[PDB]
Design a protein around this ligand. Structure first.
Ligand code: DHE
Ligand code: DHE
Ligand code: HEC
Ligand code: HEC
Lengths: 559, 559
């Protein structure tokens, strides 16, 4: 029944965070031939359909149509369903993308037909992106020997914030104490995250288009000193954080092609490219499009920690020898996305989001130690929030996209054995659609956003729990509601509050008030001691501000 | 121009040993649609061309046409060349496969046109073969609990020879001392090799079609106790050989899909499937069809040693934990095929045949040690031949398919450091087309076949060098020529002599006198001490005898 689309394709609070391959969609593709019994699309029609598919459908169904969160839509299957079924199903409407920039999930009649016909044709695989292509894109603007040998600006680099100005393809370096926008740097395409080298000198950004920029914070006027392209679609980057390996390497992960690349930490020279195509951990079936999700760096061994989504594998990649490459491929759970290290920096706790699980890896021993259901729908921790719960001991927290719950997992196998790797508590925050939870060692507060909630009141606010007041009686902890968007004084369009990030001292917490590109946005700085508004950052240049990364907290993995 | 096929597409003595995917060629395929400027082939024409392509062309160019020893033939490239060029180039034909079963490489006018047209169309990837498929094929005929707990027959198992009866889909178990055929067992179509568990109890055979049979030699009447299919095309299998891991695991390698599988050593239960799709070691470019070639077992660590051909990677796979899987991916040289361990069983020495190199791996340290050109064309060692050269010390030898040369490499870094991993000598044997070189610790002789030589007398004889007389003075060591085929007394055809294999005591060496399926074949047993004919084995059941494996010498890697 084609009417099943109403439920399958319904927009929910937890199905909007699937990849939109809008960079890859720009590539012009030639129309394939049509086998007997199938009508062909012209080159123009096929290219129009392909762009739509990559922008709106490929996230869930795959660019190769072999399935991701949504099932496979290969020609064998679609031809059995037939044109009529496809046309009907697609007419209902697809799940919306992210707010402000994402798709609405609605198509015209002409487009519906293009899509149905497109699904009946044999898709070609998008171009690969290997060493030759990377080296062609590789530019070293300032060779290492020509860079400063000491900080040449008067900035307090450790208290600096690197803020994504999403739609503009820029980042803003903002002073953590004065709130001054020190510089607005251009990278071209939208930046997804900022990461810092272990010394705090080098700022790495990765564009959604696979473009990596490395910026030297020691220059009188910090700018990009090197750049490289590592794929067509990418969302993750990290730096080497094992003691003794400071500034040695950076690693980038791609959605397409399915691969990760280890680069020289000073020049960005591409050193080792690894494909992530392989077998799913459980059913052990070949998957041709296993996207790289979060990438973290071990503090216990000279390794990178790479999440491979569709196959449910966590890779521990040893960068001490790139020719005789040692890896540990850990069978985990499918749909790995984001995660973080516990307070001790030994255990990697990551969300296998579509399956509602937290997977725990011991980075010292290189083995899986636990897989636990959070009891919530679609956990999305970011890097999560570590704190010492007054009665449970060390815990790590996550909120959820699919419900209002916050779950705590014990992270102290030696010191609180019974509590270790068990969900110790689950309680409600503002509402569903949460993306980020945050705390800091110098704070007694736990902040939870609700970015994707359908209610403006909730999406524009943040829940704050008092950790010192938590008891363990099983009751639900009370929270204070901070009216972040209201504080910023922007009601136009629909601002969505997203992601808490602390200053170096942990005395102030920043939130992004994310509005559309032609609308007014802001950053809101909250005084952590009083839970009152401290400062509002507004500027005509502050377009679609999303991710914010404090240099010190990012370089040290303090969360 | 098209006339360049006289050099690249004609039969050489060293280009007949590329994969013939004749099992995969039996699968029916769907005829693709054709884009503008290209003409479609009917279902029959496309399948006729596909069968020809898989059997004759895919070995060198790949089923996906991304290139192997021959260049890529993807539609983008072939359409630029055009039909006329393709037609003219293919009119010359293609290199012949193996004698007694392989293709002649001759094409009719109609077939030439089909192939040219096929190359202009978009190929589909053959079906994958994962856990679901393996488990459906997995049959345990005699559970472990129902098997004997001690040897229940009176055979001398360690002196048994397991002989491939290629075209009959059987193996013969032959008494090493009496030459009695103890049993003929049904297996996969054309068993490629036999391998033994470390205890010598279990006999594993793999057919070219990917079928694996496990035989319990302790039964009163040895038979298949378990079977499984691991792919569509496969050539390699090995057992765990690290002390303490006897009989724990078996591993099988496949050409298609490009993968290896680790199985339970007692039941054949498929435990871990690993894709070998990935990046080439040198150019670091994605390769969609990296075939698994030889697989050996480490004696120093609990690891399997897997050659991945097209990407030039040697994998050291640790089987102590299949869930948190540790591997070492060693960048080596492209076109890895066969090889063996040195006399100490520490170093793996393998031929990157198409590049005329020997790659050396230290299995204790898990690292590449050396890569050296043999000075010959297309080295094909089998497992090679280890001996103590009177002047040079411990050496490992290989012969070549492309010329008559035998090369020696020093294998003793500790005792003979100046000779270690250097090509110490190169001298002629009977002629080109050699496949196997052989010796044994108790023998003073080095045997070299010339199986693929185009001269009947040469292909039916073996060269034998006296190791004791070798001086390494730069002169060409003399050799005795044993007229093996003549000794067998076969009137019909021109049988080819292949592969020496010793008995357990190393006093007798066996050769196969390989004739066609409907022709007369034999096994010839030579007395090693005198170099005289010991026995001729003929039986109506001895159809197309090829590989022969002594239980003791195979379980212990004595070569
Ligand atoms: C794989 C991945 C990571 C982990 C990175 C790492 O470990 O270095 C991540 C992290 C993130 C983080 C990391 C926060 C942290 O504290 O580590 C942030 C702020 C973030 C803000 C957004 N992400 Fe993200 N994000 C994706 C993927 C990912 N996002 C998408 O596939 C997706 C859903 C859509 C897309 O096509 O890009 C998507 C949309 C968004 C947004 O619409 C967000 C809210 C705003 C924006 O700038 O695009 N993502
Ligand atoms: C990958 C591989 C190995 C290593 C096995 C291992 O490590 O377990 C091998 C070993 C072998 C060995 C191992 C000898 C040893 O002492 O280890 C033998 C006897 C052998 C007899 C043949 N091989 Fe072999 N062989 C191939 C591949 C291989 N052969 C081919 O791709 C090829 C060229 C063609 C094909 O499509 O199969 C091919 C044709 C042949 C033959 O025509 C032979 C001579 C006879 C036959 O039975 O088919 N191959
Ligand atoms: C993620 C939230 C999705 C996006 C974006 C789109 N689809 Fe999807 N689709 C999704 C689900 C969860 C399902 C149900 C089956 C499952 O995997 O659990 C589907 C189903 C379809 C189908 C039905 C095929 C069938 O065999 O019944 C079709 C034809 C389909 N989807 C097409 C499609 C297109 C063209 C999209 C872009 C507009 C699209 N989907 C977006 C999840 C998601
Ligand atoms: C291995 C021995 C081969 C087999 C079997 C076949 N081909 Fe081949 N081919 C091989 C080589 C070494 C070369 C030359 C280029 C190189 O890789 O060094 C080729 C070339 C071709 C071409 C020419 C393409 C061009 O760009 O000029 C074609 C069209 C081609 N081969 C087709 C082809 C077909 C149809 C085969 C089966 C009958 C076939 N080849 C077998 C090596 C080998």
């Amino acid at each position: 029944d084609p009417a099943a689309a109403l439920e399958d394709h319904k927009t929910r609070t937890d199905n909007r965070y699937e990849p939109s391959l809008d960079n890859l969609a720009q590539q012009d593709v030639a129309a394939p031939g049509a086998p007997e019994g199938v009508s062909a699309l012209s080159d123009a029609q096929y290219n129009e359909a392909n762009k739509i598919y990559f922008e709106r459908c490929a996230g869930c169904h795959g660019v190769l149509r072999k399935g991701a969160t949504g099932k496979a839509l290969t020609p064998d299957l679609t031809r059995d369903l037939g044109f009529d079924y496809l046309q009907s199903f697609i007419t209902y409407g697809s799940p919306a993308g992210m707010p402000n920039w994402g798709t609405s999930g609605e198509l015209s009649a002409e487009q519906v037909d293009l899509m149905a016909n497109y699904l009946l044709l044999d898709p070609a695989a998008p171009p690969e992106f290997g060493m030759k292509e990377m080296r062609e894109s590789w530019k070293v603007h300032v060779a290492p020997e020509d860079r400063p040998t000491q900080q040449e600006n008067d900035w307090d680099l450790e208290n600096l914030f690197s803020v994504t100005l999403r739609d503009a393809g820029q980042i803003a370096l903002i002073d953590g104490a004065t709130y001054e926008i020190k510089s607005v740097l251009d990278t071209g395409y939208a930046v997804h995250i900022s990461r810092l080298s272990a010394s705090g000198r080098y700022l790495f950004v990765i564009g959604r288009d696979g473009k990596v920029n490395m910026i030297d914070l020691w220059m009188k006027e910090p700018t990009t000193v090197a750049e490289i392209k590592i794929g067509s679609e990418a969302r993750s980057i990290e730096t080497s954080k094992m003691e003794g390996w400071e500034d040695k390497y950076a690693i980038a992960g791609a959605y397409w092609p399915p691969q990760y690349v280890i680069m020289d930490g000073e020049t960005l020279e591409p050193k080792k490219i690894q494909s992530t195509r392989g077998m799913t951990y459980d059913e052990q079936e070949y998957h041709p499009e296993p996207r790289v999700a979060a990438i973290l760096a071990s503090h216990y061994r000279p390794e990178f920690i790479v999440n491979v989504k569709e196959t449910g594998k966590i890779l521990l990649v040893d960068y001490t020898d790139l020719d005789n490459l040692k890896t540990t491929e850990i069978s985990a759970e499918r749909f790995l996305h984001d995660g973080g290290l516990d307070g001790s920096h030994r255990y990697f706790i990551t969300a296998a989001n579509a399956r509602n699980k937290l997977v725990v890896i011991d980075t010292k021993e290189g083995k899986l130690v636990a897989i636990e259901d959070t009891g919530g729908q679609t956990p999305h921790p970011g890097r999560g929030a570590n704190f010492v719960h007054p009665t449970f001991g060390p815990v790590w927290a996550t909120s959820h996209m699919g419900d209002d719950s916050v779950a705590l997992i014990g992270t102290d196998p030696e010191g609180h054995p019974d509590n270790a790797w068990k969900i110790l508590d689950s309680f409600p925050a503002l509402g569903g659609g949460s993306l980020f939870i945050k705390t800091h060692p110098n704070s007694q507060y736990l902040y939870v956003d609700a970015t994707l909630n359908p209610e403006a009141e909730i999406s524009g606010s943040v829940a704050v729990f008092d950790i010192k007041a938590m008891t363990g009686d099983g009751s639900d902890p009370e929270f204070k509601t901070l009216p972040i968007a209201e504080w910023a004084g922007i009601t136009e369009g629909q601002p969505r509050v997203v992601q808490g990030e602390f200053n170096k001292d942990g005395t102030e917490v920043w939130f992004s008030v994310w509005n559309g590109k032609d609308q007014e946005s802001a950053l809101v700085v909250v005084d952590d001691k009083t839970l009152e508004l401290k400062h509002v950052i507004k500027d005509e240049r502050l377009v679609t501000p999303t991710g914010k990364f404090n240099v010190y907290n990012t370089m040290t993995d303090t969360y």
